[PDB]
Amino acid sequence: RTGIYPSSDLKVEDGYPSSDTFQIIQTQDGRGAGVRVLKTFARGRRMARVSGQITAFCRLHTLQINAHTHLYDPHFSGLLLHSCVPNVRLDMAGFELWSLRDIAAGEMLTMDYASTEDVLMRQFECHCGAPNCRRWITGAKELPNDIGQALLAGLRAAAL
Template sequence: MLLSASSQPQSVKGNDPLTLCYIDEKKGLGVRTLVDCKAGEAIHRFTGEIKADIEQHSLQIWQDSHICGTEYIGYLSHSCAPNCRLDMDGFRLITVRDICANDVLTIDYAMTEDRLYRQFACHCGAPQCRRWITGRNEPVHEAGKVYLETLDCGQ
């Protein structure tokens, strides 16, 4: 029997129970877990190529070092109340709360990145949503200020 790559994703023993998926036009690609996970589980160990420069799907490991070409973690969605975090010392993806199979995995981009490849408006829906996402070490740029002012005027 032939199994096509597009058939229903299956968790294969020995492989990480994750899958890339298309979320929507705004968010693009994301990552889902195929199994239920408990809080505090290391659900994926990642590898990639380490470069000095930031790229669209890279993640910062330490100052001036970014990992790119990763299988999954470069495609994790942002949330201001994420269900996962990255352990950049152990190169592991760790859950911060219980997650159900098929849930989209999220991290807070500002937890790893000093500056982002691109700042963006956030619609994650968390009560503490910051509405405009920057790296942890950079100011909101001009377009972001205009966007936030527009939001404030509308309220």
């Protein structure tokens, strides 16, 4: 079978993601728009092993390993879009992707950025439309920036 990680040392037979199970979804410009699953996963299953390059600096497409070290993965896990009600969890100790919900073929895989990331490279507005969405997305240890308040501290006019 064939794998997403371009390195030849990561084999699909060991658990690494296969293009027969996962699909990188593209924008109009040939950029990032998440990852689509193409087999059906029941919740509580390991969907894939994760790899990448060790780096000391948080960036786009890095995932946090521990307090000072991150995993640079522009091929797979770093492409996952945020959601406030994710269907997948990143286990950054075993380096594995696990189904939180039941996931049907064709569904978009989503993760809560704040469950792994202290801070993000860029805070942003969320469109998962979950009623419990946070609207403005930051790392778990990161305060909203000055744009962030506005959308937040403004949408608190929804008092009425």
